[PDB]
């Protein structure tokens, strides 16, 4: 359904922001 | 084997083998623990996810029938099959391999690949201690849970009417089998049980208390405010004041340990003791041998109506216990009692 | 390869793996 | 009757509590 | 030897786990939707507790005829 | 060899782990044993 | 002899008799 | 010093001392078996055999005195009921005295063997060190058990010389200790067959007095002396107490189930007879036949005997009793003291009603009696308020038929209700409570007090085997590793 | 062991709330989770289904021999209630008793018949349904709600009863309840 | 039910709450990626 | 005896009236108390104090303070001897 679609790109979306904040501190100088 | 020439074998090559230091030691004790063991632990994963205890128990205990991790179990076999081993080649499964997970034979699988697993475990204990020249206390303290398996699986149901009145292999299982010894031995007034109770809350006392007395007990041995980097273990000092724990426990509780040894040792002893003082208990359950009832309290009831006690209360809980578990608990004497047979009370 | 941790560990994950996925397909199962 | 068997084994034990804390041998530090 | 980090961190075994892993959960996830499940452990299909004979739960009443007995209060 | 980092290895893991015991929470509700 | 009517009489009483855990694939 | 869990350490390494504790032992286990003989015949009540039998009397040592052929007392009665008119020197006062000469005898012995440790035979000719050989001994210790099992077996329970051993019908109604014939086919793994046990002793006897002379000849390999540690004692004692709880727990498996060696004449009934209606069945077949050939249902009911209608008691069953209900079962139920008669009961239209039977996990069973195609048609309510089963309305009449009830019928309601509560537990017995002052719970049997005491035994016993196995391994560190 | 695939994304059968049963020359609407039960507290019981959680909440039809033309021919209502009486269940308390209260004289049980309707057939053949709720000294359940449906087909009386508890009445067993009252077709 | 304008919104509405949950998760990112510092 | 379900129904509890050391007990406080606080001085007579149940509420009370106050202490007496302070935060899992 498109509510289950949209709910499931938001957790995706929302899970994956912190973890790409790491990544990108990682890969794009450090100060982490 | 002394000073004298013995020449080697390939007893003296598979031992060599056998007790090589690698990632998981095998020994000669480990031909036969991993396999016991893998195949027990395997076999009850295998019947809470995939085997049905519909024909045994007339339950659903499986994920695949929509049994949660509490509920799922592998679940013991039909009364009527009594104290029948249940061999896959056996008469009743006669090779039929699934017949035989249908006829509840996991159970009887599990239990004893369970029994010969932790028979290859405390064989480990024994070899591993003895590789490494230490004593063996560590399987001394093992053969208490092994006692509990053996009396609680094996003996109990042995001394019932078959392997049906055993635990089935699973979380609400257990918790059957605890509410069916609650309310056909009232085993919570069996003195061994009483005392099985007190050694295993005071083993946990006693891990509390003494965790807690050596953290608070450290000496300093470095700048720092975590003291877990403060303990080399190459060092040959004691990183916990002995003398300050025991004058804060003679000075808090009245009495306090002076020896480590002697504190260790009980620390070994009061859970050991108290789970082999509950297989006492459960072996005298396997024969009905309860401590069902005082009979003087039972006369002074009987002849006087205005005397209750917990303990009269605890009775009548224990009879509504069986009569409403009765039915559906053991199929096979197809209880149907109408509900007006039924103990209850009144407006509940 | 095949030592006792690579067959230790692979007897532990792979019925693991397996049984994860018979699970998570019966999560998914109407009646 | 049975009431003086439970006392006293109650009071029993309270006295061996006693004594043992109370005329413990003593820890030394030697 | 390899210290299992070393290990835990190497492309090569991402690589072929990346193919291992996944194989192995669609087994499994075929193992229960092709019906094999039920077929190889015998616990019945959500249709097939119950026959039109038999409404309720199945007993074991025989021990040297269990086979046959589990065999017609099965599911056929 | 280490040319993935060990902290996003097991990040990922964890991830998956908590996915899938989302979707077993999430089956408690739907499906087979869901009370429905 | 009518061992019908004999396992009757103990259907009732007992539910667990040999007489009718042994040979019960019939019935 | 030593402390108080380490004193018997000290006869470790004195064989003359350990052969004197060996005799202490034996002379006080002797003792205990003529005392509790003693302390049996003296309260034991030889009356009724029928009635009032040894395993309701709480007879422990009894049943084994008889089960091998001692059946008469000097007091004149025999345990079957006759009259012993010679019983002899090995009566059973003749067996506890001779208990007792050999516990004193082998006190004296003790305390020779005591004082007179330092025995040229315990030093070794070589090295003059203390030391036993263990694999000899051993040796010589099996060719004599294979000696006397052999003897045992082929003398005594064959009747060609002894008495033989117990031996009854499956039923147990007559019971009597006869000769036995060895069954040297696969009926001899017969269990419940008595010729298994001189075919077992002949042949196990034959194979003990051959590996005996096997370990008289043959040395140890020096592989297998220092892996089992056959210069050590205490492995030897590891060893046996893992015997000795193996056979602890066969002996309590063999008693609780039941056999051809524990026969229910002696020890009483099963929990399972109990379970799969052993009893019932047979005096439900004895009826139906017999009436088939015309009799009446007065008549074949008074034919059963009172005996078999008393083992369908269940509180004769030995798993209803208690772990503090001490004592002989009649203390429990009271001594019996006829049977009442079969109970059958009607309801107002004319169908058989039956009670059902009590289960042995329950402590408390309800009421109920249900009809030919296992309806329940009455019971007798909890709920009398609504109730549409109670023997009132039901209408429900019980008649008896064999006992001292026989031919009356009792249409009353609560009288209904106090004989469907008798048929509850089985057959109907009347019972004397007045003589020994009986509480009205059940008792366990000797049966069930013996499965107890050796099953707990055997457990304890392997925690001795494992604590005895790892102390032998693990010598050279018992006083603490290395500084290493 | 025969293959066939489990239902992965293939809807529910049920989550209708009932299942149909034809019996002897009747069809009703079971609930869904009741199993049948053999006990027959009546002589004349055809069926019987029993909740698998309470043995209060149970439901059972009786086709007894009838000699009249019809039920209107029977009596009124009322009538067809006093000779049935027997469905309640007979008091087994003879001990006189004023120290109950909400009752009467020797008396531990009572019923209130809390209504009644004629439903008809499709053409002019009535079904007396009825309501009583009855009501215990000790009070089991709150009372007990009995529906009564009955009509005389072919000289024989089809009479279904439903006895619920009353707090399973109103935890949510009273729609279920009159589902299965309100199905009791007999032609 | 949210406003009709931001009725299109709540499926990302349903996500929101865990949010906060997910904090202290990537806290512990955090510490792995500095090897637990 | 105390009438702990306010059923006018009282429990024995005590070695004097019948109990053996298993059975014995301190009987909780009447129902018909409630949560309402009852000390001797609120009751008419120590007769009526031990009917409804007084001894438990007393007993309770006390036992709760004594065992706070016994955490207090661990932790003052872990203070005075130069210890660390947390035998005591051990301990508030039984006190809890
Ligand atoms: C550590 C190894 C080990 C141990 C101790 C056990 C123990 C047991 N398993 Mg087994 N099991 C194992 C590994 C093991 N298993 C393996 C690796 C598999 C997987 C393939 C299985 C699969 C399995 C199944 C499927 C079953 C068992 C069962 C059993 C039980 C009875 C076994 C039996 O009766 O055979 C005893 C057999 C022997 C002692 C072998 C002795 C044979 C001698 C040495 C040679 C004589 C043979 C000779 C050729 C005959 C002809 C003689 C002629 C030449 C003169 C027992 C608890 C059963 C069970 O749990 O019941 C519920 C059961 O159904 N197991
Ligand atoms: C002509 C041949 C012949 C004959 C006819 C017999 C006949 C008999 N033998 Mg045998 N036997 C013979 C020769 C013979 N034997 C020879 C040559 C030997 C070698 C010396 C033996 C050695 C021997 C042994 C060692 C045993 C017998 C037993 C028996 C009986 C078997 C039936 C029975 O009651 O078993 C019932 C007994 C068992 C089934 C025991 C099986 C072993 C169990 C599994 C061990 C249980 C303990 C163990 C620690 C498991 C733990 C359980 C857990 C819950 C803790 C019967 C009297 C048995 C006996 O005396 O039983 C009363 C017995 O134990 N015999
Ligand atoms: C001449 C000596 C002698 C004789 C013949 C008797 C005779 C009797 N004694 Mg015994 N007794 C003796 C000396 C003797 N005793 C001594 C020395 C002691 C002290 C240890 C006792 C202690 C004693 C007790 C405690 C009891 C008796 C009882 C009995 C009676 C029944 C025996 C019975 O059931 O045993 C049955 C014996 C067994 C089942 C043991 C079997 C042997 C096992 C299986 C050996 C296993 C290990 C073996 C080495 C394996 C061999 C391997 C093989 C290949 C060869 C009987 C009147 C009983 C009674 O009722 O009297 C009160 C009883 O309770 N006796
Ligand atoms: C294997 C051992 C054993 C077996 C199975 C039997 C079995 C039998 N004996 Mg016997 N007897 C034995 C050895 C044995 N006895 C010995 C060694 C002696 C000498 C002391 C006696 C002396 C004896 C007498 C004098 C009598 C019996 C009687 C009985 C019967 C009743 C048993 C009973 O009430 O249990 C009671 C069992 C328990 C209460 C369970 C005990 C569990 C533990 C040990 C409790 C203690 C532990 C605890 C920490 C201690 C604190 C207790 C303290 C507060 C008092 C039964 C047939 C009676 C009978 O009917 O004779 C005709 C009887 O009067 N026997
Ligand atoms: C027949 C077998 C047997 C024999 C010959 C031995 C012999 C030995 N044991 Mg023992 N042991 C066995 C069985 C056996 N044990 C069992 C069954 C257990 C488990 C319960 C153990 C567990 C065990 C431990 C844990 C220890 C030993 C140790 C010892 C040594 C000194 C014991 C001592 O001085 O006790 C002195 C005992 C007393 C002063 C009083 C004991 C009183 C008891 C608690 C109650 C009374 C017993 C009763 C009268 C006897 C009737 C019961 C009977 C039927 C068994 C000695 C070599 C010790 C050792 O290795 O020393 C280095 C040691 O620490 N034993
Ligand atoms: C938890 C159980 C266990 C543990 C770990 C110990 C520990 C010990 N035993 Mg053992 N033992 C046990 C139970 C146990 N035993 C039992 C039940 C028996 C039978 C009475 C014995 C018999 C025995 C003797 C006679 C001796 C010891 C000795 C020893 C020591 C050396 C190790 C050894 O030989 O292992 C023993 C090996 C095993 C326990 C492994 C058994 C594995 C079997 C063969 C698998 C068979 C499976 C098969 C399919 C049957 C299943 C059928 C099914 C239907 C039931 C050590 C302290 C020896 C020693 O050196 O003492 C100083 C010694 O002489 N043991
Ligand atoms: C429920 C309680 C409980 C569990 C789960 C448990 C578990 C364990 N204890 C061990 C050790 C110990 N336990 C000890 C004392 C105690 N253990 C206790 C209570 C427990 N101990 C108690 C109370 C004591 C005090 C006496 C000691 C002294 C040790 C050890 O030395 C040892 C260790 O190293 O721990 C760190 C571990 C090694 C066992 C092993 O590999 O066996 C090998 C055999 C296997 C795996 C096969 C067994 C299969 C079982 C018997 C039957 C099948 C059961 C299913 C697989 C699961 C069913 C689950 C449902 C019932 C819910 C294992 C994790
Ligand atoms: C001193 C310490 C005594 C401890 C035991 C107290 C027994 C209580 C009592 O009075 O019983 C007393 C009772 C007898 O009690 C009386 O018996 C009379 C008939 O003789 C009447 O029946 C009376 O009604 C009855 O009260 O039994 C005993 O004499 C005890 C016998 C001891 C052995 C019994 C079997 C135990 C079996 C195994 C035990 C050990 C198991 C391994 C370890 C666990
Ligand atoms: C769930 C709720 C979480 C609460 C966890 C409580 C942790 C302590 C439990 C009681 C311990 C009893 C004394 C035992 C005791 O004193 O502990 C010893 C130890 C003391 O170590 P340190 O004093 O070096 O560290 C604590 C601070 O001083 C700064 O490191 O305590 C801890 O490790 C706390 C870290 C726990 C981190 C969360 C887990
Ligand atoms: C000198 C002499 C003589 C005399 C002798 C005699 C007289 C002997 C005896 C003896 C005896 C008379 C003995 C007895 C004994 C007993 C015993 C030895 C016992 C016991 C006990 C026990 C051990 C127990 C325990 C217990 C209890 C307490 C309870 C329960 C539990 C139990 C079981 C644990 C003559 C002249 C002949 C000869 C010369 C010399
Ligand atoms: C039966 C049998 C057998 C055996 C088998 C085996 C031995 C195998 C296996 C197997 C296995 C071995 C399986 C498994 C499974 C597993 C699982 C199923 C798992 C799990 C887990 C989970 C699901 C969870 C996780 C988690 C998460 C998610 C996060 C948090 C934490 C936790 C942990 C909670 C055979 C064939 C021989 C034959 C006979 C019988
Ligand atoms: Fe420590």
């Known amino acids: ?32 | 084997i002394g000073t004298y020439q013995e020449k080697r074998t390939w007893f003296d090559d598979a031992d060599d083998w056998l007790r090589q230091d690698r990632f998981v030691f095998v020994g000669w004790s480990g031909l036969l623990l991993l396999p016991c063991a893998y195949f027990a632990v395997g076999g009850w994963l295998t019947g809470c996810t995939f085997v049905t205890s519909w024909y045994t128990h007339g339950l659903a205990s499986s994920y695949i029938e929509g049994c949660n991790f509490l509920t799922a179990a592998v679940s013991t076999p039909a009364n009527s099959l009594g104290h029948s081993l249940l061999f896959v080649w056996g008469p009743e499964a006669q090779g039929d391999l699934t017949r035989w997970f249908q006829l509840g034979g996991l159970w009887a699988f599990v239990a004893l690949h369970g029994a010969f697993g932790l028979i290859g475990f405390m064989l480990r204990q024994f070899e591993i201690a003895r590789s490494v020249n230490l004593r063996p206390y560590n399987a001394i303290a093992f053969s208490a849970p092994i006692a509990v398996f053996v009396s609680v699986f094996l003996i109990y149901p042995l001394g019932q009417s078959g392997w049906f009145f055993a635990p089935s292999f699973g979380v609400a299982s257990i918790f059957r089998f605890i509410l069916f010894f609650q309310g056909f031995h009232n085993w919570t007034l069996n003195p061994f049980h009483m005392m099985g109770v007190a050694g295993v809350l005071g083993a946990a006392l006693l891990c509390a208390i003494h965790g807690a007395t050596v953290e608070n007990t450290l000496f300093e041995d470095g700048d720092g405010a975590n003291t877990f980097r403060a303990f080399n273990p190459t060092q040959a000092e004691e990183t916990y004041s002995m003398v300050t724990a025991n004058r804060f426990w003679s000075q808090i509780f009245g009495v306090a340990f002076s020896n480590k040894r002697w504190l260790h040792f009980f620390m070994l002893f009061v859970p050991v003791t108290g789970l082999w003082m509950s297989a006492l208990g459960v072996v005298g359950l396997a024969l009905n041998l309860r401590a069902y009832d005082f009979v003087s309290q039972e006369i002074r009831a009987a002849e006087d109506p205005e005397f209750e006690t917990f303990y009269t209360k605890n009775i009548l809980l224990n009879e509504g216990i069986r009569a409403w578990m009765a039915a559906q608990d053991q199929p096979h004497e197809k209880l149907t009692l109408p509900e007006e047979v039924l103990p209850r009370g009144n407006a509940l | 390869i095949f030592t006792v941790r690579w067959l230790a560990i692979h007897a532990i994950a792979v019925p693991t793996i397996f049984f994860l996925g018979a699970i998570t397909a019966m999560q998914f199962i109407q009646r | 009757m049975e009431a003086l068997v439970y006392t006293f084994l109650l009071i029993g034990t309270l006295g061996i509590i006693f004594f043992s804390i109370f005329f413990r041998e003593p820890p030394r530090i030697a | 030897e390899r210290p299992f980090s070393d290990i835990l961190t190497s492309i090569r075994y991402w690589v072929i786990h990346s193919i291992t892993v996944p194989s192995l959960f669609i087994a499994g996830w075929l193992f229960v939707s092709t019906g094999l499940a039920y077929d190889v452990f015998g616990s019945p299909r959500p249709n097939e507790y119950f026959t039109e004979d038999r409404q309720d739960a199945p007993l074991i009443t025989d021990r040297f005829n269990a086979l046959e007995q589990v065999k017609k209060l099965s599911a056929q | 060899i280490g040319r993935i980092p060990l902290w996003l290895v097991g990040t990922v893991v964890g991830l998956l782990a908590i996915g899938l015991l989302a979707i077993f929470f999430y089956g408690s509700y739907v499906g087979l044993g869901s009370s429905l | 002899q009518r061992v019908r009517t004999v396992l009757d009489m103990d259907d009732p009483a007992k539910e667990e008799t040999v007489k009718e855990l042994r040979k019960d694939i019939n019935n | 010093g030593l402390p108080w869990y380490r004193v018997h350490t000290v006869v470790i390494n004195d064989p003359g001392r350990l052969i004197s504790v060996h005799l202490m032992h034996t002379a006080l286990v002797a003792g205990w078996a003529g005392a509790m003989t003693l302390f049996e015949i003296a309260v034991f009540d030889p009356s009724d055999p029928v009635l009032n039998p040894m395993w309701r009397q709480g007879m422990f040592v009894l049943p084994f005195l008889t089960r091998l052929g001692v059946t008469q007392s000097w007091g004149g009665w025999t345990i079957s009921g006759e009259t012993s008119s010679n019983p002899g020197i090995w009566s059973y006062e003749g067996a506890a005295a001779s208990h007792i000469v050999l516990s004193g005898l082998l006190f004296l012995a003790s305390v020779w063997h005591w004082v007179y440790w330092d025995l040229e035979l315990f030093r070794d000719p070589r090295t003059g060190k203390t030391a036993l050989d263990l694999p000899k001994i051993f040796g010589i210790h099996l060719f004599l058990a294979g000696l006397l099992c052999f003897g045992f077996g082929a003398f005594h329970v064959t009747g060609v010389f002894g008495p033989g051993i117990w031996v009854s019908d499956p039923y147990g109604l007559t019971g009597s200790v006869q000769p036995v014939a060895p069954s040297w086919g696969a009926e001899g793994f017969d269990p419940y067959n008595p010729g298994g046990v001189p075919a077992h002793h002949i042949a196990a006897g034959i194979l003990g007095v051959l590996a005996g002379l096997f370990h008289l000849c043959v040395r140890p390999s020096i592989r297998l002396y220092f892996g089992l540690s056959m210069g050590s004692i205490e492995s030897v004692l590891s060893s046996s107490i893992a015997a000795v709880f193996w056979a602890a727990f066969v002996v309590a498996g063999t008693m609780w189930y039941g056999s051809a060696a524990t026969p229910i004449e002696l020890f009483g009934p099963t929990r399972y007879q109990w379970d799969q209606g052993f009893f019932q069945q047979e005096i439900q077949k004895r009826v139906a036949q017999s009436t088939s050939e015309g009799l009446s249902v007065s008549e074949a009911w008074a034919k059963i005997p009172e005996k078999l209608a008393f083992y369908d008691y269940i509180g004769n069953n030995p798993a209803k009793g208690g772990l503090f209900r001490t004592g002989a079962m009649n203390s429990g139920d009271g001594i019996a003291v006829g049977w009442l008669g079969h109970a059958s009961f009607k309801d107002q239209e004319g169908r058989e009603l039956f009670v059902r039977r009590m289960p042995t996990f329950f402590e408390t069973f309800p009421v109920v009696l249900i009809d030919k195609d296992g309806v329940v048609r009455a019971d007798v309510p909890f709920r009398k308020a609504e109730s549409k089963y109670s023997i009132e309305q039901v209408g429900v009449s019980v008649t008896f038929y064999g006992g001292e009830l026989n031919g009356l019928t009792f249409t009353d309601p609560s009288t209904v209700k106090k004989y469907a509560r008798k048929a509850q537990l089985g057959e109907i017995f009347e019972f004397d409570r007045s003589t020994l002052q009986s509480d009205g719970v059940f008792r366990s049997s000797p049966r069930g007090w013996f499965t107890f005491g050796h099953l707990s035994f055997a457990l304890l016993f392997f925690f001795g085997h494992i604590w005895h196995g790892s102390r032998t391994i693990f010598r050279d560190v018992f006083a603490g590793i290395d500084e290493d | 062991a025969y293959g066939e695939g489990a239902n992965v994304f293939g809807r529910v059968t049920n989550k209708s709330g009932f299942v149909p049963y034809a019996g002897d020359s009747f069809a009703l609407l079971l609930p869904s989770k009741w199993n049948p039960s053999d006990e027959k507290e009546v002589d004349s019981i055809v069926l019987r289904y029993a909740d698998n959680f309470d043995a209060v909440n149970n439901v059972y039809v009786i086709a007894q021999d009838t000699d009249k033309s019809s039920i209107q021919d029977y009596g009124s209502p009322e009538e067809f209630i006093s000779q049935f009486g027997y469905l309640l269940g007979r008091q087994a308390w003879a001990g006189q008793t004023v120290s109950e209260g909400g009752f009467d004289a020797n008396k531990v049980s009572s019923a209130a018949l809390l209504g009644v309707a004629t439903e008809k057939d499709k053409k002019g053949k009535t079904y007396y349904k009825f309501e009583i709720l009855s009501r215990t000294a000790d009070g089991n359940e709150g009372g007990r709600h009995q529906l009564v449906k009955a009509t005389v087909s072919n000289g024989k009386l089809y009479l279904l009863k439903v006895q619920a508890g009353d707090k399973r009445w109103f935890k949510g067993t009273d729609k279920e309840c009159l589902g299965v009252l309100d199905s009791f077709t007999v032609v | 039910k949210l406003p009709e304008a931001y009725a299109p919104f709540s499926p990302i509405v349903d996500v929101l709450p865990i949010i906060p949950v997910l904090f202290i998760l990537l806290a512990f990112v955090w510490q792995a990626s500095v090897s637990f510092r | 005896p105390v009438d702990i379900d306010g059923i006018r129904e009282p429990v024995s509890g005590s070695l004097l009236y019948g109990n053996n050391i298993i059975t014995g007990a301190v009987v909780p406080t009447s129902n018909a108390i409630g949560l309402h606080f009852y000390p001797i001085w609120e009751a008419a007579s120590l007769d009526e104090w031990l009917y409804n149940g007084g001894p438990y509420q007393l007993v309770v009370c006390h036992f709760f303070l004594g065992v706070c106050c016994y955490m207090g202490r661990e932790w003052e007496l872990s203070y005075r001897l130069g210890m660390r302070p947390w035998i005591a935060v051990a301990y508030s899992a039984p006190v809890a």
Do not use: D, E
């Open chain 1, 1 to 32: 359904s498109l509510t289950l679609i949209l709910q499931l790109v938001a957790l995706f979306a929302v899970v994956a922001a912190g973890p790409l904040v790491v990544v990108l501190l990682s890969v794009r100088g450090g100060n982490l």
